[PDB]
């Protein structure tokens, strides 16, 4: 139901609100496309930490040049 | 009122009468039922109109990229 509401809407803090549950779930291939429609380059640190606990490096390589875009760090 | 009970019953009786002009005006004026159940059974309706109602609840979902998929069989 989440996954819809958000559809229908549009508002980056919703996505950031289903990445934080997908984080707490242990879906980390689910979380990038919770960050591609938001934009948020922020909470990367928690979303990097995950990345270790399950091989996914194919979509968090987008995800971290999308962020360079936003926070030169 | 928009009432969601009432919206699904009626919209199940619409399904049961083969009715797609009254479908049109509920689904126009109001919008507080599941759309993706509702559309997830026009499509098996064997109906062209069904199915064109079911595409035009999804697009209206903003599921884009997956409506057009559909009513491209």
Redesign the interface.
């Given at each position: 139901r989440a996954y819809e509401f958000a559809e229908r809407c549009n508002e980056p803090a919703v996505w950031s609100q289903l990445a934080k549950a997908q984080l707490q779930k242990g879906m980390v291939k689910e979380a990038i496309d919770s960050y591609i429609k938001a934009d948020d380059p922020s909470s990367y640190m928690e979303v990097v930490q995950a990345a270790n606990t399950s091989g996914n490096w194919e979509e968090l390589v987008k995800y971290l040049q999308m962020a360079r875009k936003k926070a030169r760090e | 009122h928009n009432n969601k009970s009432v919206n699904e019953s009626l919209n199940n009786l619409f399904i049961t009468e083969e009715d797609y002009q009254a479908l049109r005006t509920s689904i126009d004026a109001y919008d507080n039922f599941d759309n993706?159940s509702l559309a997830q059974r026009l499509e098996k309706h064997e109906l062209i109109e069904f199915r064109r109602i079911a595409a035009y609840l999804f697009k209206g979902?903003?599921?884009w990229k997956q409506s057009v998929e559909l009513c491209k069989k």
């Open positions: - | 993706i979902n903003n599921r």
